[PDB]
Structure 1
Amino acid sequence: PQYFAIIGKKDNPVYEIEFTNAENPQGFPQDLKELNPFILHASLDIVEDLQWQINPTTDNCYLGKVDHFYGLAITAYISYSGMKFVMIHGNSANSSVVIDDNNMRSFYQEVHELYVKTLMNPFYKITDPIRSPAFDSRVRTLARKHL
């Protein structure tokens, strides 16, 4: 299971979704209610640290797994307007994420495309939650096809 989020510049979320494998019909045992918002706000610190630097620990829009913490692989992405696309990776065992950078990158690229399609609405201003079910339908089909 994976918790996905898009966070504003003033530390607020515009999108949040949690999606799991169907074998575990309930997902993230006891971490979902308490741990997963807090470790994401913790990772916002180090994504804010690496946004301004030149040579990382190329092209600065994607970046790798940013930390590893209670066996959870936390993967980020930084848009052009400053939005941050932090999405974590859970499993009962340890998880490999770097092998999915052939696929994950493409996933962050077209959800960036979806966010640009959201932003081009003149009615939708920033610091608003993305309250659209069509956006949910596209991001869960992209979650299915980029598993």
Structure 2
Amino acid sequence: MSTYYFVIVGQNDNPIYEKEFSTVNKELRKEDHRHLTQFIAHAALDLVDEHKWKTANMQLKSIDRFNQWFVSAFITASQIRFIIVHDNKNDEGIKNFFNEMYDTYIKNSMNAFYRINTPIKSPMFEKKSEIFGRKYLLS
């Protein structure tokens, strides 16, 4: 199968949120995935910042490929760093998946109570993300 990992990064490099869909097993190793990739999102970011200074493309499909960890970047106008990291490729899912992530993010970013670079606990957003994952990633 494919592994599933989403991350949300504030402008101030704050990891706002992270979402998972992989078949549940060895939860300690899934947390290892989390920090592995959250700290991979570190050089990925130190890289993708100049990459975004190069191209203002819709979405930076590939930033690094660790030969088992894959870096896909959809950076926002507010520079919100977004990365999907997976052991397997699925480009068509990920492109418009980051699209729909961005969309529901706009929806839940409008609310005045949110302030820049802040974790968002809205389980409505959780189920919106889950529906997207079942649409564009999971089967």
Q: Aligned partners of 1:18, 1:139: CA distance in 2, in Å?
A: 10
Question: Do 1:60 and 1:78's aligned partners in 2 also have CA atoms closer than 8 Å?
Answer: no
Structure 1 runs, 4 residues or longer, greater than 2 Å off: 24-34, 100-103
Q: TM-score, normalised by structure 1?
A: 0.80
**Aligned counterpart, 2:54:** 53
How far off its partner does 1:12 sit?
Answer: 0.4
Structure with the larger RCO, 1 or 2 (CA within 8 Å, 6+ apart): 2
> Of 88, 92, 95, which residue of structure 2 is paired with 1:105?
95
Structure with greater strand percent: 1
Residues 70 and 34 (structure 1), Cα distance of their counterparts in 2 relative to 1, 3 Å cut: farther
**Aligned counterpart, 1:85:** 82
How far off its partner does 1:103 sit?
Answer: 2.6
How far off its partner does 1:65 sit?
Answer: 1.6
Cα deviations across residues 40-66 of structure 1 (Å, max 9, x unaligned)? 112111111111114xxxx51201221
Question: Do 1:67 and 1:73's aligned partners in 2 also have CA atoms closer than 8 Å?
Answer: yes
* Gap regions ≥5 residues in structure 2: none
Structure with greater helix percent: 2
**Aligned counterpart, 1:40:** 41
How far off its partner does 1:19 sit?
Answer: 2.0
Residues 74 and 119 (structure 1), Cα distance of their counterparts in 2 relative to 1, 3 Å cut: same
Residues 36 and 101 (structure 1), Cα distance of their counterparts in 2 relative to 1, 3 Å cut: closer
Query: How many residues align structurally?
Result: 134
Q: TM-score, normalised by structure 2?
A: 0.85
How far off its partner does 1:80 sit?
Answer: 1.4
Question: Do 2:59 and 2:75's aligned partners in 1 also have CA atoms closer than 8 Å?
Answer: yes
- Over the aligned positions, Cα root-mean-square deviation in angstroms equals 2.0
Q: Percent identity?
A: 36
Residues 117 and 34 (structure 1), Cα distance of their counterparts in 2 relative to 1, 3 Å cut: closer
Corresponding residue SS for 1:65: coil
* Gap regions ≥5 residues in structure 1: none
User: Larger Cα Rg: Structure 1 or Structure 2?
Assistant: 1
Aligned pairs (5 A) from 1:1-147: 1-20=3-22, 22=23, 25-26=25-26, 29=29, 31-32=32-33, 34-54=35-55, 60-90=57-87, 95=88, 97=89, 100-147=90-137
